Amino acid sequence: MTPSISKDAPIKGSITISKKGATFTAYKLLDAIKSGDAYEYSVNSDLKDFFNNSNYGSYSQESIQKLNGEQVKEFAINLHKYILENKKSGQELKDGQKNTVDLGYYLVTETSSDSEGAAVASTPIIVSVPQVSGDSWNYDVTINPKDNTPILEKNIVKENQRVKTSSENIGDVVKYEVKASIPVYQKNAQNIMYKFTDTMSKGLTYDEKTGFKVTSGDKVFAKDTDYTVDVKKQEDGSTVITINFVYENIKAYAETGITLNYQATLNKDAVISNKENLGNTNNIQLDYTNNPHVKDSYKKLTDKVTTYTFGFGITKVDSELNSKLLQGAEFSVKDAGGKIVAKYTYDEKGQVVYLSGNGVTNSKGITTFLGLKEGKYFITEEVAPSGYSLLKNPVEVTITANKDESGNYTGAATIEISNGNKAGQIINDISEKDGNILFNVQIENHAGFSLPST
C-alpha cells in the first residue's frame, strides 16, 4: 500500500550521489505517472525491447513488482547487459550535486573511466524516484556507491617487526612482506587485472631460489597456475619483477587478501654512504581494474622500503710524519662478538671486489672495508708495515646511523673512536668516483730506530 500523494508534490525529483571524480549514468526504464492517489508505470520506448528478450532473462513488465533481494541484483545485471549490448544512451549524474530527474524507475551505473582515490567502480544500482519513506514519498533520493577500496603496503621483516627501513651487511638478506587487498567486482565481470610490479635497485639481488610465497590467510597459491613470475634485469642494474595474477583464482579469497613473502640479498653494488640518500630500495606497485566495462580503466597503488649500509677506509701513516703513507700494513675487522665482517673492498681501479683475507694498505696507505651496518667494530693491525712496530691495541670504532622523527634510517651516519686509542683519528670522508662515501680512520705506526754505536 503506497502512501498518499501530496497536492504540492513536485513533478520532478532528484538523485544525489557522492563519489569524487566519478560520473554515474541513470537509465530510465519506467515513467511514473500520477492517477488519483497513486503512481502508475509506463515503459520508456527506447528500452521497450529489453522486455521479453531471450538473452536478457526474458523479463516481463509484471515481473518487476515481485522480485527477491538477489533477483533484483540479477535483474540489474541483465538490464545492464542490455544497455551495454545495444549501446543505449542515458542521463549523466554529476558528483556531490542534486541531479534533477523525471519520476520513475532507474538503473544507475558508474560510467566514468576514472575516479579519485583507490576505489574500484560501483556495482549497478536499481533506484526509484520518488521512493517510499514511512507515510510519505521522498523525491530527493541519495545513493551511496556499492564499491570497495583496496590497500597496499610493503614492509621489511626484521626481528619479527615490520619496518619501512633497515640496515645490513653486504652479503646478508633483506626479507620483504607485501600486504594487499583483493578488489571485488560484480559477477558478470571479465578481464580483471591484478598485477604486481616490484622494482629492486641495483644493490639488491632477488633471491630466485627462495622466490615468492603467495598466500591468502591459510591458502597457498601455486606458481604457473594462479600467477606467473617475470624477472627482468635492467640496463641500470635494477631488477623488475612482474607477478601477474589469474584473478579468477583469487576471486574467492577477497576476505583475507593477498600476502607476498620474498627476499633479496644486499650486494657489492649497493649504495654505501654516510649522507642522507635513497639507499637500496624495494618498490612495489599494484595495477588493478577500476571499472570493468570501460576499456583502459585501471588504477595503481604504490609503496616502498629501503635498506642502507656503510663503510670505512683506513689511511696508514707514520707516527712522526703523518704525511708519509705506509704500504703493506694488514688489518682485520671484527664486529661486536669477535666475528670477521666486511668481506668486500675497493679495487686498485675502483671496483668493489671480494676480500678473502686481511685488508692490505695501498701504495697510498689505504684499505677499504665495505658493506657494514651501524655498530661497534674492532680494527686490528695483523701485520705491521716493513720496519715498524705493531699497534699494541685495536682501534675500536662505533658507527651511528641517523634516524628521523618516525624512527626510520635516513642513510646518514657518524663514526668515532670508542675505546680511546690515540693511534687512531677520524679524518676526511673518502668520496669514491662511483658515488659511494666512506668514513676514514687514520692510524699511526711507530717506526723502529737504531741507536748509535761507538
Coordinates of C-alpha atoms in Angstrom, one line a residue:
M1 CA 0.0 0.0 0.0
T2 CA 1.6 3.2 -1.3
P3 CA 1.4 6.5 0.7
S4 CA -0.9 9.3 -0.4
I5 CA 0.4 11.9 -2.9
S6 CA 0.5 15.5 -1.7
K7 CA -1.1 18.1 -3.9
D8 CA 2.2 20.0 -3.6
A9 CA 4.3 17.1 -4.7
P10 CA 6.9 18.2 -7.3
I11 CA 6.7 17.0 -11.0
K12 CA 10.4 16.3 -10.9
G13 CA 12.7 14.6 -8.3
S14 CA 16.4 14.3 -7.8
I15 CA 19.2 11.8 -7.3
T16 CA 22.3 12.8 -5.3
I17 CA 25.3 10.6 -5.4
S18 CA 28.7 11.2 -3.7
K19 CA 31.9 9.8 -5.1
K20 CA 34.7 12.2 -6.1
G21 CA 35.9 12.2 -9.7
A22 CA 33.3 9.7 -10.7
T23 CA 30.4 10.0 -13.2
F24 CA 27.3 7.9 -13.0
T25 CA 24.6 7.3 -15.6
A26 CA 20.9 6.9 -14.9
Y27 CA 18.8 4.9 -17.4
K28 CA 15.0 5.4 -17.2
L29 CA 13.2 2.1 -17.6
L30 CA 9.7 3.3 -16.4
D31 CA 8.0 6.7 -16.3
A32 CA 5.9 7.3 -13.2
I33 CA 2.6 9.0 -13.9
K34 CA 0.1 10.2 -11.3
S35 CA -3.5 9.0 -11.3
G36 CA -5.8 9.6 -8.3
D37 CA -3.8 8.7 -5.2
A38 CA -1.1 6.5 -6.8
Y39 CA 1.8 6.4 -9.2
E40 CA 1.4 4.2 -12.3
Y41 CA 4.1 3.0 -14.7
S42 CA 4.6 3.1 -18.4
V43 CA 7.8 1.8 -20.1
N44 CA 10.3 4.0 -21.8
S45 CA 10.1 3.3 -25.6
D46 CA 13.9 3.3 -26.1
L47 CA 14.2 0.4 -23.5
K48 CA 11.0 -1.3 -24.5
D49 CA 13.0 -4.1 -26.3
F50 CA 14.7 -5.3 -23.1
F51 CA 11.3 -6.7 -22.1
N52 CA 10.5 -10.3 -23.2
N53 CA 14.1 -10.8 -24.5
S54 CA 15.6 -14.2 -24.5
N55 CA 19.3 -13.5 -23.7
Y56 CA 18.3 -10.9 -21.0
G57 CA 16.5 -13.1 -18.6
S58 CA 13.3 -12.6 -20.7
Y59 CA 11.7 -10.3 -18.1
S60 CA 8.1 -9.2 -18.4
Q61 CA 6.7 -5.9 -17.1
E62 CA 4.6 -7.6 -14.5
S63 CA 7.6 -9.4 -13.1
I64 CA 9.4 -6.4 -11.6
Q65 CA 6.8 -5.8 -8.9
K66 CA 7.6 -9.2 -7.2
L67 CA 11.4 -9.7 -7.1
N68 CA 13.8 -11.1 -4.4
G69 CA 16.8 -9.4 -2.9
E70 CA 19.1 -11.3 -5.3
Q71 CA 16.6 -11.4 -8.2
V72 CA 16.9 -7.6 -8.1
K73 CA 20.7 -7.9 -8.5
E74 CA 20.2 -10.4 -11.3
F75 CA 17.6 -8.1 -12.9
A76 CA 20.1 -5.2 -12.6
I77 CA 22.8 -7.2 -14.4
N78 CA 20.5 -8.3 -17.2
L79 CA 19.3 -4.7 -17.7
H80 CA 22.9 -3.5 -17.6
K81 CA 23.8 -6.2 -20.2
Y82 CA 21.1 -4.9 -22.4
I83 CA 22.2 -1.2 -22.1
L84 CA 25.8 -2.1 -22.9
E85 CA 24.9 -4.7 -25.6
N86 CA 22.7 -2.2 -27.5
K87 CA 24.9 0.9 -26.9
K88 CA 22.0 2.7 -25.2
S89 CA 22.4 6.3 -24.0
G90 CA 21.3 7.7 -20.7
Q91 CA 21.5 10.7 -18.3
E92 CA 24.8 11.6 -16.7
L93 CA 24.7 12.4 -12.9
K94 CA 27.5 14.7 -11.7
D95 CA 29.1 14.2 -8.2
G96 CA 28.2 16.0 -5.0
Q97 CA 25.1 17.5 -6.5
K98 CA 21.4 17.4 -6.7
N99 CA 20.6 15.8 -10.0
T100 CA 17.1 16.6 -11.4
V101 CA 15.4 13.5 -13.0
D102 CA 11.9 12.5 -14.1
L103 CA 9.8 10.4 -11.8
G104 CA 10.1 6.7 -12.4
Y105 CA 12.3 3.6 -12.2
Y106 CA 16.1 3.9 -13.0
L107 CA 19.2 1.8 -13.4
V108 CA 22.3 3.7 -12.2
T109 CA 25.8 2.7 -13.2
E110 CA 29.3 4.2 -12.8
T111 CA 30.3 5.1 -16.4
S112 CA 33.4 7.2 -15.9
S113 CA 36.8 5.6 -16.7
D114 CA 38.4 7.2 -13.6
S115 CA 37.7 8.4 -10.1
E116 CA 39.5 9.9 -7.2
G117 CA 41.2 7.6 -4.7
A118 CA 41.8 3.9 -4.8
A119 CA 38.2 2.6 -5.1
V120 CA 37.1 0.4 -7.9
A121 CA 33.8 1.0 -9.8
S122 CA 30.5 0.9 -8.1
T123 CA 28.1 -2.0 -8.8
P124 CA 24.9 -1.3 -10.8
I125 CA 22.1 0.2 -8.8
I126 CA 18.3 0.0 -9.1
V127 CA 16.5 3.1 -7.7
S128 CA 13.0 4.6 -7.9
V129 CA 12.0 8.3 -7.6
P130 CA 10.2 9.0 -5.6
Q131 CA 10.7 6.2 -3.1
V132 CA 8.7 5.3 0.0
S133 CA 9.6 6.8 3.4
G134 CA 7.1 6.0 6.1
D135 CA 3.7 7.6 5.2
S136 CA 5.2 9.8 2.5
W137 CA 7.2 9.9 -0.7
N138 CA 10.8 11.1 -0.9
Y139 CA 11.5 12.9 -4.2
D140 CA 15.1 13.8 -3.3
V141 CA 16.9 10.4 -3.0
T142 CA 20.5 9.7 -2.2
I143 CA 22.6 6.7 -3.3
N144 CA 25.9 5.7 -1.8
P145 CA 28.1 3.7 -4.3
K146 CA 28.4 0.0 -3.9
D147 CA 32.2 -0.2 -4.1
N148 CA 35.4 -1.3 -2.2
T149 CA 38.8 0.4 -1.6
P150 CA 41.9 -1.7 -1.8
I151 CA 45.1 -1.1 0.2
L152 CA 48.7 -2.0 -0.4
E153 CA 51.8 -2.0 1.9
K154 CA 55.4 -3.2 1.6
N155 CA 57.4 -3.9 4.7
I156 CA 60.9 -5.2 5.6
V157 CA 60.7 -8.1 8.1
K158 CA 63.5 -7.6 10.6
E159 CA 63.5 -9.2 14.1
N160 CA 59.8 -10.1 13.9
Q161 CA 58.9 -6.5 13.2
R162 CA 57.6 -4.6 10.1
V163 CA 59.7 -1.5 9.2
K164 CA 59.9 0.8 6.2
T165 CA 63.6 1.0 6.5
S166 CA 66.6 -1.2 7.7
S167 CA 70.4 -1.7 7.8
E168 CA 72.5 -4.7 6.9
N169 CA 76.0 -6.0 6.0
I170 CA 76.6 -6.6 2.3
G171 CA 76.1 -10.4 1.7
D172 CA 73.1 -10.6 4.0
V173 CA 69.3 -10.9 3.3
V174 CA 66.5 -8.4 3.3
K175 CA 63.1 -10.1 3.8
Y176 CA 60.1 -8.4 2.2
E177 CA 56.4 -8.8 3.0
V178 CA 53.6 -7.3 0.9
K179 CA 50.0 -7.0 2.1
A180 CA 47.4 -6.1 -0.5
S181 CA 43.6 -6.1 -0.8
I182 CA 41.9 -8.2 -3.5
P183 CA 39.3 -5.8 -5.1
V184 CA 35.8 -7.2 -5.7
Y185 CA 33.6 -6.6 -8.7
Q186 CA 30.1 -7.8 -9.9
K187 CA 29.8 -11.4 -11.2
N188 CA 29.3 -10.5 -15.0
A189 CA 32.8 -9.0 -15.0
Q190 CA 35.7 -10.3 -17.1
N191 CA 39.3 -9.4 -18.0
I192 CA 40.1 -8.2 -14.4
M193 CA 43.7 -7.2 -14.0
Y194 CA 45.5 -7.9 -10.7
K195 CA 49.3 -7.5 -11.3
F196 CA 52.3 -6.6 -9.1
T197 CA 55.4 -4.8 -10.4
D198 CA 58.3 -4.8 -8.0
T199 CA 61.4 -2.8 -8.7
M200 CA 64.6 -3.5 -6.7
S201 CA 67.6 -1.1 -7.1
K202 CA 70.9 -2.5 -8.3
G203 CA 72.1 -3.0 -4.7
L204 CA 69.6 -5.8 -4.3
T205 CA 69.8 -9.3 -5.9
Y206 CA 66.4 -11.0 -6.0
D207 CA 66.7 -14.5 -4.4
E208 CA 65.3 -16.6 -7.3
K209 CA 65.8 -19.9 -5.3
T210 CA 63.6 -18.9 -2.4
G211 CA 61.3 -17.0 -4.8
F212 CA 57.7 -15.8 -4.0
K213 CA 55.4 -17.4 -1.4
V214 CA 51.9 -16.2 -2.4
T215 CA 49.3 -16.5 0.3
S216 CA 45.7 -15.7 1.3
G217 CA 45.3 -16.3 5.0
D218 CA 45.7 -20.0 5.1
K219 CA 45.6 -20.7 1.3
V220 CA 48.9 -21.2 -0.5
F221 CA 48.8 -20.2 -4.2
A222 CA 50.5 -22.1 -7.0
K223 CA 53.0 -20.6 -9.4
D224 CA 52.3 -21.0 -13.1
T225 CA 48.6 -21.7 -12.3
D226 CA 47.3 -18.8 -10.2
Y227 CA 50.2 -16.4 -11.1
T228 CA 53.3 -16.1 -13.2
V229 CA 56.6 -14.6 -12.1
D230 CA 58.5 -12.5 -14.6
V231 CA 62.0 -11.3 -13.7
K232 CA 63.9 -8.9 -16.0
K233 CA 67.4 -7.4 -15.3
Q234 CA 67.5 -3.7 -16.4
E235 CA 70.4 -1.9 -18.0
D236 CA 70.9 0.4 -15.0
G237 CA 71.3 -2.6 -12.7
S238 CA 67.9 -2.7 -11.2
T239 CA 65.5 -5.7 -11.3
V240 CA 61.9 -5.5 -12.4
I241 CA 59.7 -8.4 -11.2
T242 CA 56.1 -8.8 -12.5
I243 CA 53.7 -11.1 -10.6
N244 CA 50.6 -11.3 -12.8
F245 CA 47.6 -13.0 -11.4
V246 CA 44.7 -15.0 -12.8
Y247 CA 42.1 -13.0 -11.0
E248 CA 39.5 -15.9 -11.1
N249 CA 41.8 -18.0 -8.9
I250 CA 42.0 -15.4 -6.1
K251 CA 38.4 -14.1 -6.6
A252 CA 37.0 -16.2 -3.7
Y253 CA 39.8 -15.1 -1.3
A254 CA 39.0 -11.4 -1.1
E255 CA 38.2 -11.5 2.6
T256 CA 41.8 -12.3 3.6
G257 CA 43.5 -10.6 0.7
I258 CA 47.0 -11.4 -0.6
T259 CA 50.3 -11.7 1.1
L260 CA 53.6 -11.9 -0.7
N261 CA 56.8 -13.2 1.0
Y262 CA 60.1 -12.9 -0.8
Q263 CA 63.7 -11.7 -0.3
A264 CA 66.8 -10.2 -1.8
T265 CA 70.4 -10.1 -0.8
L266 CA 72.3 -6.8 -0.5
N267 CA 75.1 -6.9 -2.9
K268 CA 78.6 -5.4 -3.7
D269 CA 76.9 -2.9 -6.0
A270 CA 75.0 -1.4 -3.1
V271 CA 74.8 2.3 -2.2
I272 CA 77.5 2.8 0.5
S273 CA 77.2 6.2 2.2
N274 CA 77.1 8.3 5.3
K275 CA 74.9 11.2 3.9
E276 CA 71.1 11.1 3.5
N277 CA 70.3 9.2 0.4
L278 CA 67.7 7.0 -1.3
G279 CA 69.5 3.8 -0.3
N280 CA 68.9 0.3 -1.7
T281 CA 65.2 0.4 -2.5
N282 CA 62.4 -2.1 -3.0
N283 CA 59.3 -0.6 -4.8
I284 CA 56.0 -2.5 -5.2
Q285 CA 53.3 -1.4 -7.5
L286 CA 49.8 -2.9 -7.9
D287 CA 47.9 -2.3 -11.1
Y288 CA 44.2 -3.3 -10.9
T289 CA 40.9 -2.8 -12.8
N290 CA 38.8 0.1 -11.8
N291 CA 35.7 -0.1 -14.0
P292 CA 35.4 -3.5 -15.8
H293 CA 33.1 -2.1 -18.5
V294 CA 35.2 0.8 -19.7
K295 CA 38.3 0.0 -21.8
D296 CA 41.7 1.0 -20.3
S297 CA 40.1 1.7 -16.9
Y298 CA 42.8 0.9 -14.3
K299 CA 44.2 2.2 -11.0
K300 CA 47.6 1.9 -9.3
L301 CA 48.8 1.6 -5.7
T302 CA 52.5 2.0 -4.7
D303 CA 54.7 1.6 -1.6
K304 CA 58.4 1.4 -1.0
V305 CA 61.1 0.4 1.6
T306 CA 64.8 0.9 1.6
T307 CA 67.9 -0.7 3.1
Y308 CA 71.2 1.2 4.0
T309 CA 74.8 0.2 4.6
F310 CA 78.0 1.9 5.4
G311 CA 81.8 1.5 5.2
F312 CA 85.2 3.0 6.2
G313 CA 88.7 3.3 4.8
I314 CA 92.0 3.1 6.7
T315 CA 94.8 5.6 5.9
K316 CA 98.1 4.2 7.3
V317 CA 100.6 6.8 8.2
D318 CA 104.0 7.3 10.0
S319 CA 104.0 8.3 13.7
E320 CA 106.2 11.4 13.4
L321 CA 105.3 12.2 9.7
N322 CA 101.6 11.8 9.1
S323 CA 102.5 12.9 5.5
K324 CA 104.2 9.5 4.9
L325 CA 101.9 6.8 3.7
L326 CA 102.7 3.2 4.7
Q327 CA 102.1 0.3 2.3
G328 CA 102.0 -3.4 3.2
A329 CA 100.3 -3.0 6.6
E330 CA 97.5 -5.5 7.1
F331 CA 94.2 -5.1 9.0
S332 CA 91.3 -7.3 10.1
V333 CA 87.9 -6.1 11.0
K334 CA 85.6 -7.8 13.6
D335 CA 82.2 -6.9 14.9
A336 CA 81.0 -6.9 18.5
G337 CA 81.3 -10.6 19.3
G338 CA 84.6 -11.1 17.5
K339 CA 83.3 -12.4 14.1
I340 CA 85.0 -11.2 10.9
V341 CA 83.0 -8.9 8.7
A342 CA 83.5 -6.5 5.8
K343 CA 84.4 -9.2 3.2
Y344 CA 84.3 -6.6 0.4
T345 CA 86.9 -3.9 -0.6
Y346 CA 87.8 -1.5 -3.3
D347 CA 89.9 -2.4 -6.4
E348 CA 93.1 -0.7 -7.4
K349 CA 90.8 0.6 -10.1
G350 CA 87.6 1.5 -8.1
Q351 CA 85.6 -1.7 -8.5
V352 CA 84.1 -3.5 -5.5
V353 CA 85.7 -6.9 -5.2
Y354 CA 85.5 -9.7 -2.6
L355 CA 88.0 -9.5 0.3
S356 CA 89.2 -13.0 1.1
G357 CA 91.7 -12.1 3.8
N358 CA 93.1 -9.0 5.6
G359 CA 92.9 -5.5 4.2
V360 CA 96.3 -4.6 2.8
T361 CA 97.3 -1.0 2.7
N362 CA 97.7 0.7 -0.7
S363 CA 100.8 2.4 -2.0
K364 CA 98.9 5.4 -0.7
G365 CA 98.4 3.5 2.6
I366 CA 94.7 2.9 2.1
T367 CA 92.5 -0.2 2.6
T368 CA 88.7 -0.1 2.4
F369 CA 86.1 -2.3 4.3
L370 CA 82.7 -2.1 2.6
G371 CA 79.1 -3.2 3.5
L372 CA 78.8 -2.6 7.2
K373 CA 75.7 -1.7 9.2
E374 CA 75.9 0.6 12.2
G375 CA 77.5 -0.7 15.5
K376 CA 80.9 -1.3 17.2
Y377 CA 83.8 -2.8 15.1
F378 CA 87.3 -3.6 16.1
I379 CA 90.2 -2.7 13.7
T380 CA 93.2 -4.8 14.4
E381 CA 96.7 -4.5 12.8
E382 CA 97.5 -8.1 11.9
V383 CA 100.8 -7.4 10.2
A384 CA 103.0 -4.3 10.6
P385 CA 104.5 -2.4 7.6
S386 CA 108.2 -3.1 7.0
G387 CA 110.4 -1.6 9.7
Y388 CA 107.6 -0.7 12.1
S389 CA 106.3 -1.8 15.4
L390 CA 102.9 -3.4 15.9
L391 CA 100.0 -1.5 17.4
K392 CA 99.5 -3.0 20.9
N393 CA 95.7 -2.4 20.8
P394 CA 92.8 -2.5 18.4
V395 CA 91.3 0.8 17.2
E396 CA 87.6 0.4 18.2
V397 CA 85.1 2.4 16.2
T398 CA 81.4 2.9 16.5
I399 CA 79.2 3.8 13.6
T400 CA 75.9 5.6 14.5
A401 CA 73.1 5.7 12.0
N402 CA 71.0 8.9 11.7
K403 CA 67.2 8.4 12.2
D404 CA 64.2 10.6 11.6
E405 CA 61.2 11.7 13.7
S406 CA 59.4 8.5 12.9
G407 CA 62.4 6.2 13.8
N408 CA 63.4 5.4 10.2
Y409 CA 67.0 5.3 8.9
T410 CA 67.8 8.3 6.6
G411 CA 71.1 6.8 5.3
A412 CA 73.2 9.4 7.2
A413 CA 75.7 8.2 9.8
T414 CA 78.6 9.2 12.1
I415 CA 81.7 7.4 13.4
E416 CA 84.1 7.8 16.3
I417 CA 86.9 6.1 18.2
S418 CA 85.1 4.4 21.1
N419 CA 88.0 2.8 23.0
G420 CA 90.2 5.8 23.2
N421 CA 93.1 4.5 21.1
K422 CA 95.3 7.5 20.3
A423 CA 96.9 5.7 17.4
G424 CA 93.6 6.4 15.6
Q425 CA 91.8 9.5 14.5
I426 CA 88.7 10.2 12.2
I427 CA 89.8 12.3 9.2
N428 CA 88.0 13.5 6.0
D429 CA 85.4 11.2 4.4
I430 CA 86.6 9.3 1.3
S431 CA 84.4 10.1 -1.8
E432 CA 84.5 7.3 -4.4
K433 CA 84.1 8.1 -8.1
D434 CA 81.1 5.7 -8.3
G435 CA 79.2 8.0 -5.8
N436 CA 79.8 6.0 -2.6
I437 CA 81.0 7.8 0.5
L438 CA 83.2 6.1 3.1
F439 CA 84.4 7.1 6.6
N440 CA 88.2 7.5 7.1
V441 CA 90.2 6.1 10.0
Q442 CA 93.8 7.4 10.0
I443 CA 96.1 5.1 12.0
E444 CA 99.7 5.9 13.0
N445 CA 102.6 3.4 13.1
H446 CA 105.8 3.9 15.1
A447 CA 109.0 3.4 13.0
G448 CA 111.9 1.4 14.5
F449 CA 115.2 3.3 15.1
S450 CA 118.7 2.1 15.6
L451 CA 120.8 3.6 18.4
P452 CA 124.4 4.9 17.8
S453 CA 127.4 2.5 18.4
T454 CA 130.8 4.0 19.2

